[PDB]
């Protein structure tokens with residue numbers, strides 16, 4: 001026969017899926033597939049929490065396809081070899097999938113497509129994870145943006161796309177077809193343990209399309225109205241917690257935008273309106289960094305701006321280790337690192353703090369931090385993670401004047417009552433917020449909690465000194 005294969009990667013859902021919808025308009029014999037790629041799964045940068053969330057998403061996706069009328073095929077191996085082989089064995093009319101913005105995915109995709117073209121099989125690659133593709137947002141000179149402001153002004157004025165239809169009444173494969181591909185398939189979805197992973201720390205939102213959609217709806221129904229200023233406080237549960245759903249596509253970007261937009265139209269309060277616009281802004285920042293990675297792939301290599309490619313990083317392994325183990329002695333920093341390692345998620349204000357701390361205070365090549373975050377974030381995303389770490393030094397996009405966060409000031413400003421500190425550092429619940437914020441704790445009252453591993457003021461001067469010496473040397 002002539003079925004169409006849809007290749008899932010970061011769009012683990014049946015609803016509001018550009019590529020899937022386009023494929024369904026071409027054939028009802030729509031068969032989904034997912035390939036466990038060893039280069040990604042065996043990577044030292046793979047987070048256990050991310051594999052757990054992913055596996056949970058795949059489980060639901062299997063059901064969705066089954067309920068739709070067909071199935072989700074599962075494979076394990078090199079994509080450019082297995083996908084074309086599968087398509088050929090199935091004499092596929094075509095293979096569809098949504099475009100990636102990352103170096104690895106785009107290179108791989110080019111290879112799969114070329115392999116398919118050689119086999120004489122059509123490959124269709126459409127944009128789905130962004131409201132606007134990188135090629136849609138360009139300046140008057142037709143160039144990409146490296147500064148947020150102007151990018152936002154353009155992006156904001158562009159007509160927003162709406163959710164596409166969920167495919168239905170699919171036609172499943174026949175025994176003869178199933179026999180032709182048997183050797184390429186896994187008999188069942190491997191469990192987290194079978195893959196060699198273990199995770200018991202939970203998630204910001206339960207895995208799956210259904211849970212993602214429920215969270216989006218619940219958030220936009222209430223919490224979003226207070227997004228600003230509730231977003232600034234780690235102690236408050238003021239954010240959506242949809243990050244992993246967006247990274248793995250458990251939710252469609254158009255559904256997200258439409259939900260927020262409908263909430264803004266329904267709201268009759270200026271403050272709420274503003275809160276919702278602010279949340280929408282976050283989605284814009286998301287596209288700013290994704291577009292940036294797309295347009296400037298070298299960003300993924302580390303410090304982008306020339307000066308920073310030459311920064312004299314101290315790199316004291318011991319300080320890094322202390323940082324990864326939440327033993328820095330800075331309460332606000334340790335409480336954040338603990339939440340990360342224990343739950344695979346961290347409040348953005350906290351990520352900004354620990355990143356600033358690692359880069360500015362500990363003076364460690366921020367790539368070590370970027371890597372550590374990727375090894376633990378359930379939402380670990382190259383574009384966003386790299387953007388965040390380039391940000392800790394203004395070494396990439398949207399650069400700002402040299403600046404160093406003061407842990408105490410941030411803590412006092414965003415966790416004034418030390419509620420968040422106490423929450424993740426229970427062995428310090430007896431200490432007074434006053435001291436947890438200043439980071440100056442008396443030994444006895446400190447119990448086993450380590451003392452600050454560095455003197456902020458001395459580190460601050462050291463960093464500025466190196467910066468200036470280099471700035472001058474250049």
Ligand SMILES: Cc1cc2nc3c(=O)[nH]c(=O)nc-3n(C[C@H](O)[C@H](O)[C@H](O)COP(=O)(O)OP(=O)(O)OC[C@H]3O[C@@H](n4cnc5c(N)ncnc54)[C@H](O)[C@@H]3O)c2cc1C
Nearest residue numbers: 239240241242243286348351352355379380381384385388
């Ligand atoms: C050093 C550091 C590393 C980071 N690592 C990642 C990462 O690997 N993956 C990840 O998706 N985000 C990352 N962020 C951005 C950010 O902290 C999160 O997206 C956020 O914590 C997600 O929580 P939420 O879903 O409740 O966000 P909400 O506030 O509800 O925002 C909604 C959505 O907007 C997007 N978003 C929000 N903040 C930004 C931003 N600053 N940059 C890019 N997208 C944004 C996310 O997709 C998010 O789910 C990083 C930030 C820093 C400073």
